[PDB]
Amino acid sequence: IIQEFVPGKQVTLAHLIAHPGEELAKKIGVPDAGAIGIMTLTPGETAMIAGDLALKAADVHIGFLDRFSGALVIYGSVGAVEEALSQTVSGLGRLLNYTLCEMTKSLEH
C-alpha cells in the first residue's frame, strides 16, 4: 500500500567542538574561533528559527545556516557556544515541541 509521509520535528544533534583549529575552520569557511557548534534540524527550515534562538542566547555568530539540510553552524568562545547550543535546543522544545537530543562535546586537544 501507499505510505504517507510528513517531516518530523527533530533536533538530530547539537554538538560543541572546542578549538577546532585553522585547518578545519578553513575547510568549512567559518572563522577560526574558540568553538564551533553544529546542529542538524528537521524540517530544514528550522535552521532559520534556531539561528534566531542561538544569536539571542549568547555572544555567538552564525558560521552558516542552511535551510536545505537544516544545518546551523555557530561560532564564538567555548562558553558562549555551549550556552547558545543549550538554549537553542531547550527553546525548540519549549516553543515548538521538538524531539530533542543530548548536548554533546568534543574537548580541546
Residues 14-29 as b/e (b if ≥16 CB within 10 A, e otherwise) read: bbbbbbbeeeebeeee
Among 25, 33, 47, 53, binds Cl ion (CB under 5 A): 33
Q: Cell 524531539 maps to which residue? A: 99
DSSP character at residue 59? S
CB of 86 to a second copy, least distance (A): 15
Closest CA to 107 of 59, 35, 40: 35
Alpha-carbon span 1 to 48, nearest angstrom: 36
User: Is there binding between residue 100 and a second copy (CB under 8 A)?
Assistant: no
- Residue 9 touches which of a second copy, Cl ion, none (Cβ within 5-8 Å per kind): a second copy
Contact pick of 9, 12, 13, 34 for Cl ion (by CB under 5 A): 34
- Residue 2 site contact among Cl ion, a second copy, none (CB < 5 to 8 Å, cut-off depends on kind): a second copy
Q: CA geometry: angle at 47 spanning 45 and 48, to 5°? A: 75
Site residues, a second copy (CB under 8 A): 1-10, 12-13, 15, 17, 20-21, 23-24, 27-29, 36, 38-40, 42-46, 48-49, 51-53, 55-56, 61-62, 64-71, 73, 91, 95-97, 99, 104-107, 109
